[PDB]
Design a protein around this ligand. Sequence first.
Ligand code: PRO
Ligand code: MG
Length: 364
Amino acid sequence: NTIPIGIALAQTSNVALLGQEQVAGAKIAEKYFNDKGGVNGTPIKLIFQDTAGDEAGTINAFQTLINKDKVVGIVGPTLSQQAFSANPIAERAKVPVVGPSNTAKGIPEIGDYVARVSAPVSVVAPNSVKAALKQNPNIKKVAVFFAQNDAFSKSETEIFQQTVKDQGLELVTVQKFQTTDTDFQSQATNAINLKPDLVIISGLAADGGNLVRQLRELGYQGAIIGGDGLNTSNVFAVCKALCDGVLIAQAYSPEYTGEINKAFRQAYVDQYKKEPPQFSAQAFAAVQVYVESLKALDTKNKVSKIQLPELRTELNKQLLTGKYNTPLGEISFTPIGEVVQKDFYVAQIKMEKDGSQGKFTFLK
Ligand code: PRO
Ligand SMILES: [Mg+2]
C-alpha cells in the first residue's frame, strides 16, 4: 500500500531541457524519503504524467493524475504559462498543487489549492543585475530581450527592466522574440547597433541559448545575464563555448549544510557526476513538502485510511502551515501559498573542453 503523488512536468519537448532536471530531483526525493520509511512506514509512489511543452499537454496530465491516477496532490507543472492554464483544474477538483518552478507573478493567486516552492522573479532576478554591476561597475547601456509568447518571460522581463532603470542605467532597447524562434539576427543586430554594455535575456533554454550564440557571433562582447529559463545544465549543449560567462541568479546553493541538502547533493553527484542544479533542488523540495505534510497528518490519523477527497483537502491545509528544512534552506508559506525564502545567489557559466562540458560556478 502506497500514497500516490502526481508529478506533472515537461518530460518531452524543448521544455524538457528544464523539465528533465525536475524529474531527476523528484526521483532522488522518492528514493530518499522512501529509504527513510516514507510516511511513517507507508511508502510514497510518484506517478509521472508528461505535460510536454504546451497548455493542452498540461491540461491532459492534470486531468489524468486527478481522475485516473487518483493522486493526493500534484508537483508541477514546469512553466508558469502551463500553470495558469492547468492549475484551475486542480483548484476545481480540490487537489493541491505545489509548483516547483513557476516564478511568474500571480501563481499563488490562481487559487487556495495552489502553492509554490519556487521564489518569484521579483526576489530572484535582481541579484544577477547586482552581480553584473559588481563585475563591471561601468555598465551604462542595457539591452533587454524577452519571449513575448511566454507568461514567465513577460513577468521576468518587467523585473529586469525596472531593476536596471532603478540602478540609473540606460535601457536602450527591449527586443521581442518567441520561445519557438530559431533566428534572432534582426533583434540581435538592432540591439548591438545601440551599443549596450549589458544584455539580459528572458526566455527558455533552447531559445535563450541560441540567442546567446547569435549575439556573440554578431560581435557582442559585453556582459550577459540569463533569466531563470536559461538556468539549466542542459543549456550548456545549446550555447556551447559561447555560454561562458553568462550570469544567472539562483534560488539554491549546493553548499548549504542542511542534512537533507547534504543527502540530496550526495545522491545527485553519485548519479550524475555533477553538482545538483536549482530545478532539481526545487523539485525535491516540492516532494519534501508533501512527504512531511503527510507525516504530520499521519501522526493524528493514519493516511492510508483517509478517503481521497478528505485527504486532498487536509493535505492542502496542512502543507500551507508547515515549516521545512529543504535543499533550498528553511522555507514556509504565506496564507496564499507564496514561498517564504530570503537567501539567493548568483552563478556564472564556466565552459571547458572546447565548449563540450560546463558548470555553474557560484559567485561568493
Ligand atoms: O515560471 C516559469 O515558467 C519559469 C520556468 C523556470 C523557472 N520559472
Ligand atoms: Mg494559493
